[PDB]
Every structure is written in structure tokens, then in C-alpha cells.
Enzyme design. Structure first.
Site, PDB file in Angstrom:
ATOM      1  N   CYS A  84       0.995  -1.247  -0.050  1.00 37.15           N
ATOM      2  CA  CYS A  84      -0.071  -0.220  -0.113  1.00 37.15           C
ATOM      3  C   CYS A  84       0.729   1.175   0.074  1.00 37.15           C
ATOM      4  O   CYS A  84       0.117   2.347  -0.202  1.00 37.15           O
ATOM      5  CB  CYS A  84      -0.978  -0.038   1.408  1.00 37.15           C
ATOM      6  SG  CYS A  84      -2.443  -1.078   0.899  1.00 37.15           S
ATOM      7  N   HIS A 130      -2.415   7.703   1.808  1.00 38.86           N
ATOM      8  CA  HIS A 130      -3.320   6.728   1.562  1.00 38.86           C
ATOM      9  C   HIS A 130      -4.403   6.271   2.634  1.00 38.86           C
ATOM     10  O   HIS A 130      -4.080   6.196   3.858  1.00 38.86           O
ATOM     11  CB  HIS A 130      -2.181   5.657   1.517  1.00 38.86           C
ATOM     12  CG  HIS A 130      -2.769   4.173   1.438  1.00 38.86           C
ATOM     13  ND1 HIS A 130      -3.083   3.694   0.110  1.00 38.86           N
ATOM     14  CD2 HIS A 130      -2.985   3.225   2.313  1.00 38.86           C
ATOM     15  CE1 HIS A 130      -3.669   2.644   0.336  1.00 38.86           C
ATOM     16  NE2 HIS A 130      -3.541   2.233   1.578  1.00 38.86           N
ATOM     17  N   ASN A 177     -10.048   0.540  -0.548  1.00 44.12           N
ATOM     18  CA  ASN A 177      -8.603   0.487  -0.613  1.00 44.12           C
ATOM     19  C   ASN A 177      -8.123  -0.266  -1.807  1.00 44.12           C
ATOM     20  O   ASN A 177      -8.067  -1.240  -1.878  1.00 44.12           O
ATOM     21  CB  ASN A 177      -8.012  -0.315   0.545  1.00 44.12           C
ATOM     22  CG  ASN A 177      -6.570  -0.349   0.949  1.00 44.12           C
ATOM     23  OD1 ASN A 177      -6.152   0.303  -0.065  1.00 44.12           O
ATOM     24  ND2 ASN A 177      -6.109  -0.658   2.029  1.00 44.12           N
ATOM     25  N   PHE A 232     -10.276  -3.965   0.694  1.00 42.04           N
ATOM     26  CA  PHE A 232      -9.578  -4.095  -0.402  1.00 42.04           C
ATOM     27  C   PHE A 232     -10.442  -3.957  -1.741  1.00 42.04           C
ATOM     28  O   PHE A 232     -11.596  -4.437  -1.673  1.00 42.04           O
ATOM     29  CB  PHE A 232      -8.581  -5.291  -0.619  1.00 42.04           C
ATOM     30  CG  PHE A 232      -7.552  -5.567   0.615  1.00 42.04           C
ATOM     31  CD1 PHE A 232      -7.247  -4.417   1.097  1.00 42.04           C
ATOM     32  CD2 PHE A 232      -7.164  -6.668   1.118  1.00 42.04           C
ATOM     33  CE1 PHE A 232      -6.211  -4.565   1.872  1.00 42.04           C
ATOM     34  CE2 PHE A 232      -6.243  -6.836   2.197  1.00 42.04           C
ATOM     35  CZ  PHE A 232      -5.898  -5.820   2.801  1.00 42.04           C
TER      36      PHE A 232
END
Lengths: 375, 375
Positions: A150, A289, A322, A201
Site C-alpha cells: 500500500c 493513503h 482500498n 480491499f
């Protein structure tokens, strides 16, 4: 020169999942309807994620065709590779074509390619597949960034800065392409941290063009990449691990993760901005992020950020989930488009200096200092 | 500045196999002794390999404990990962410690780390493991180059050149660590190409220190990295492929591979040496990835290289086999040590300009132009 982002585009698979509907769907498709307490835990995880929807190339039909992927630990790496290795450069090509068209120059002027994914490795890699799909020059200088998780959306900017600034006239195409094919799996009461990934995710791809000597008559700067640093966080060993196994990519998370990032992030800001003379973290624009929502909440609280500093970051998380390395590139795209539409003075929400953060295994914080461009 | 190699060291696991004995050993441990015609073919492959010995962390005892690895396509990735993911940074640390000792500067002055392997992926990667094992600074800027195969020993030099030359005072540690754990498997009549890999692949690690502004009072240049190019060969799609599967890393090779490299290598030489003004390929020193012996034979024949131009490259292949990315780094170490001991005028066999080639999937030729250093 100085490395400058000249174009940005994104792409997602057309299938989307509504987060409010996902717990029922997930516990049904994985044959887990007897795990009533775990399902309620998963509902709370999905509610707390602040994700509205996620795009996924993994459809119900594909999952029904791959029952071992719907087990918790089914032997399934081959089935996952067969899906993901085609999807990763395909979605990457979709994003790259749009970025190349925005840029508007011949693809023969692309001298370097950086490809980044954690969704499956192959030889030759996704960089080769993308080069052939796009028709780039065979002499394109490739760097294939595999399995860095990530924080790699910042990593690719750190790499691109050195590539473009050390090679006069170079133009780097960056492509990040991520998906849930390696990580999707059935639930287990022994492995709550896997459930977190199942709630967060998502799939997405982003592409950028970067050059250090933009020609003002043909190219249009969006952001400048001023500096790029990376650090490992003290005492954080083992907090996030991902293992590539016969059952796919298994994710292992410790409870302490947001506390590690929030307790150490100010050091990265001090180190990056002291040479610039900036110490007011509300006076810069932010790209963070966002794939761990408690990370952003705790960073915001720890640093005393105003509640709208992370708006663009949280918006991308709400609309896409994500998407690993691609997130921060989507957030850059969201910010410059929203700033243009709203008439802000710069691509950085009217501010001149900005920071971009990648967070991932290590732990590892990547810190990129940015400058915006006027209107 | 100009990217300069300041130290090189290598490491191998202590266990080694003598190639003259390997066909008997390999066909016994894979329970394939009834396949007599295939064994004779393997004997010929091993004889034509021009390998005398190879180092391998895989022992007879470890193979007996992992029968799935001894089948041709046994479910074995988990067992392979369990061995390889600790061995890769362990062997890399051994080489890295030696290179840092040669260099003679404190490890705290290492600002960047490049780690390269195709022997197994993990999150965080081998770069993280090596950082912790060595006690490098937490702020070391890491680049993890996974799964790029046999040209990546040139790739890491291409990367190190841009990192060192764009960051004043930076010192990059490069580590390449490879092994046979993902690829070892039993034989199959219809997969002779896998048999080729069983005759060639080996374990080893190499480490380098690179910097663009060497301090002559404390540091000792060995080679200068003048330029670095990469290209894909025409019409070569699918000639070499490696797939990461439930049975490990499977290798697939078409028959035409040496002809692709030898038909195209002179274009890479002309492209690289036109700015320098060299056209006599016997007037430069040579570091050529030797893991495919027919490749070097055909290149030698096609270009008219004199019989000892490839001596250092073939020596490493003879004493160590095909260690993938590490080979060209072993060859650089062999060359500078041989030149010192033979009283040559430069580290490049008495010559000023040199070429370093990586060959791998794509196809892909990496071409690095080097300058030697006097005595």
C-alpha cells in the site's frame, strides 16, 4: 529540471459492490451463514470502513466458478493467477491510454515505464504485457515494482523523480494496477485480520506521465515532485505481513497498526519540511493513503489537522475502497479536477506546498513533498 | 558525478553439487531412474552446460523431507517459500557484510538499498529483511526488484546509476540473491525445457556499493557505470516464460532462444557505443550473463570475438552455474581480482571501455556501458 506530473488517469472494473450489501453477499458466497457472530463483526467492520462502494473484477459468476477461492484456505493460487495476470495489465492499459491521450504526445516519446502491482507476479511481468498492449517502443526502460503493497503509490513517484531528473528529455509512464483476486477468501474465526482486508480491499488502476523538463507549449504541469523519503517505523516489526501461498495472498495484521503510524508520522513531516521552512501542517495540502480509516483518524487527531485536510483522500476511499498503490494517484486526480471545477487558485486546494503519504508493510512510511501548479 | 562501483563481494551456500555426478543424483532423488532415455538426455545437457559445480542450499536431506518438490508438478509452493524466503536475505546479508567491509565506511552512510531476487516474494520483502539483519538506517531508501530473472543484474546497475547521480552524496547498497528452491522439480518427457533449468540453475548472492562522488582519500573506484539501456527483441514474445504456481516456479523455453539473442546483440552494441565511437567489439572488455551457454557461443561466433574475450564470464559459469541476476556481479568481481593479480593496466583486462549484458524474459537485453579504472 524537476520531476513534474503532466497527466493522470484512472480506471476501474465495471462490476461494483455496494458496501451496505456486502456482509450478506460475502457470508452467503463463502458458505459461512452459520458464523452469525462473525457476520455481525464483519457488518461492524464494513460500517466503520466509511466505504460506500468498491469495484471488483471478481464477480459472483467468477466466484461460483472458483469454489476454492471461496474457502478460507483453499488451494487456489493457480486459479487466482489465471484471473489476475490478465486483469492487471488490461486495467493498466485502460488507465494508461487515457493518461497518454490527456498528455497528447506520441507514445514513441515515452522513454521509461514504471509498473506497480501486488496482485500477481509473472515472468515476463506486467510491465512487458503493458508495453506490448500499448505499442511502446521496444527500447522503453522498464522498472517492475512487484508486491510492495500500500505504500508503492508513493514509491513510484520517488523512483520517477530520479529517472526523469537524471535523463534529459525523458518521459516516464507510471501505471499502478491492483485488485482483490489474490486476497479474496472465506472467513475464519481464528483470523479476524483477514476480515479487515475483505472489508477494505478493492480494484483500480491509475496512470501518470512524468517529465523533468516540461515544454510549456505542449505540456501542462499538475504537480511537482520536490522530495521523496522512506522510513521504517521503530518497534513495528511484523505489524503487517502478506504471504504468497498456495491459498493465495494471506494478510496478517496486528491491532497496533494505526497507533504506530500516528505516533511516528510527525517525524516524517519534520524531516521533510524543515529544509523548506514549513511547520504548519494545516498550511499544506494532503494526499494520504486512506486504505486504513483508523490510520487517517488518528493521524488527523495526533497532528491537529483541520477536519477537511483529508477530504480528497477520504472521498476516494468512500467511492473506491482500498485500491492499494493506486489510491494516492486517484486522490491526486480527484484533487486537481475538484480544484479546477471549484476555481481554486492551485491544484493543491489553493495551497502551494503539499505532502503525499504511502503507508504499508515494514511498517514503512513513504513521504513525498509536492508543489502545486497555479490554476 | 558519475555512478562508480566502490566494492563487490559474493557469497554461496556451503553445499555444492559436482556437475559430473548430478545426473545420477538428480534422477535418484526424483525417483526417475526408470526414465533411461530422459536420463541420457539430461546427462548430455549437463555435459554441454560447461558447468563444473554449483552451490545449492537444497540438500538431499531437505529434498527427502519435501517429496512434493521432487515430483514434476507437485503442490509445493508453501514448502519452497518456507525455505527460500529465509535463505534469500541470509545469503544476501553474507555478501553485503563483505562488501561493506571492503568499502570500509560506516553502514550509516548507506542511503539507498536495492534488493533483487526471483527466488520468492514476501511482504515486507527481502529488502526489509536485509535492512533489519544489517542494522541499516531506518530511513534507507529501498527499491525491491522482484521476479525479473536473469537480466536483473544489469537492471540493478541501471537503477543504481540514476539513484546515485540524482542524489548528492548518496551511497547505494545493491544486493542480488538467487537460489534453486522455487525451480527444482522432477523430470518429465514432454518438458525438456524444464530439464534445461535443472542442469543450469544455481545459488549465489552478490553485493555492491555504488556512489557518484567517490572520495579518493577513502574510497576505491573499480568501474564506472557510463550508460544503461534496455530493449525487447523483435518477434521474441513467449520465448522464455516463468510462472509462479502451486508447484513453484515453472520454466518454459522455446528452441530459438540463443538465435534471438545472437541475431540482435549487435544492434544493442551499436546503439550503446555510437556516442563513444567504438566499433571493434574485441577492443572493449566483456561481462556477459553466461547462464545460457549457447547464447555466448553464438554471440562469440556472430561478432567474431577472440577466444578469451568471454573468459571471465565462462569462468563464473564453470565454477558456479547460472545464479540468475548475481552472475554478472560475480563476473565483475572475478574480472577486477584477476586483473589485479595478472598486473593488468585496468580493471577491464587492460582496456578502457567495457560492456555488461543481462539476458532474460521478454526476451529483453540489458546493455550497460562500463569504464574500467587504472591499476
Amino acid at each position: 529540471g524537476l520531476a513534474t506530473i503532466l497527466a493522470i488517469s484512472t480506471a476501474t472494473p465495471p462490476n461494483c459492490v455496494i458496501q451496505a450489501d456486502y456482509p450478506d453477499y460475502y457470508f452467503k458466497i463463502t458458505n459461512s451463514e452459520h458464523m452469525t457472530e462473525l457476520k455481525e463483526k464483519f457488518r461492524r467492520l464494513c460500517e466503520k470502513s466509511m466505504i460506500r462502494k468498491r469495484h471488483m473484477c471478481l464477480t459472483e459468476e467468477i466466484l461460483k466458478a472458483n469454489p476454492n477461492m471461496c474457502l478460507h484456505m483453499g488451494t487456489s493460487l493457480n486459479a487466482r493467477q489465471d484471473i489476475s495476470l490478465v486483469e492487471v495489465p488490461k486495467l493498466g492499459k485502460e488507465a494508461a491510454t487515457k493518461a497518454i491521450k490527456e498528455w497528447g504526445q506520441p507514445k514513441s516519446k515515452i522513454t521509461h515505464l514504471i509498473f506497480c502491482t501486488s496482485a500477481g507476479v509473472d515472468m515476463p511481468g506486467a510491465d512487458y504485457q503493458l508495453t506490448r498492449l500499448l505499442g511502446l517502443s521496444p527500447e522503453v526502460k522498464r522498472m517492475m515494482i512487484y508486491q510492495q503493497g500500500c505504500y508503492a503509490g508513493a514509491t513510484v513517484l520517488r523512483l520517477a523523480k530520479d529517472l526523469t531528473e537524471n535523463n534529459k528529455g525523458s518521459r516516464v509512464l507510471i501505471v499502478c494496477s491492483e485488485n482483490t483476486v489474490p486476497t479474496f477468501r472465506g472467513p475464519s474465526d481464528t483470523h479476524i485480520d483477514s476480515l479487515v482486508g475483505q472489508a477494505l480491499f478493492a480494484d483500480g488502476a491509475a496512470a501518470l506521465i512524468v517529465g523533468a523538463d516540461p515544454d510549456a507549449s505542449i505540456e501542462r504541469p499538475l504537480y511537482h515532485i520536490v522530495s521523496a523519503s522512506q522510513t521504517l517505523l521503530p518497534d513495528s516489526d511484523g505489524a503487517i505481513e502478506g504471504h504468497i501461498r498456495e491459498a493465495g495472498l494471506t494478510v496478517h495484521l496486528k491491532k497496533d497498526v494505526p497507533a504506530f503510524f500516528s505516533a511516528n508520522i510527525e517525524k516524517s513531516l519534520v524531516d521533510a519540511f524543515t529544509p523548506i521552512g514549513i511547520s504548519d501542517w494545516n498550511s499544506i495540502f494532503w494526499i494520504a493513503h486512506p486504505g486504513g480509516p483508523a490510520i487517517l483518524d488518528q493521524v488527523e487527531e495526533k497532528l491537529g489537522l483541520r477536519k477537511d485536510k483529508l477530504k480528497a483522500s477520504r472521498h476516494v476511499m468512500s467511492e473506491f475502497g482500498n485500491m492499494s498503490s493506486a489510491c494516492v494517484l486517484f486522490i491526486l486526480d480527484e484533487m486537481r479536477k475538484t480544484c479546477l471545477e471549484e476555481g481554486k487558485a492551485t491544484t493543491g486546494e489553493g495551497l502551494d506546498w503539499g505532502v503525499l503519504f504511502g503507508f504499508g508493510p515494514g511498517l514503512t512510511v513513504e513521504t513525498v513533498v509536492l508543489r502545486s501548479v497555479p490554476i
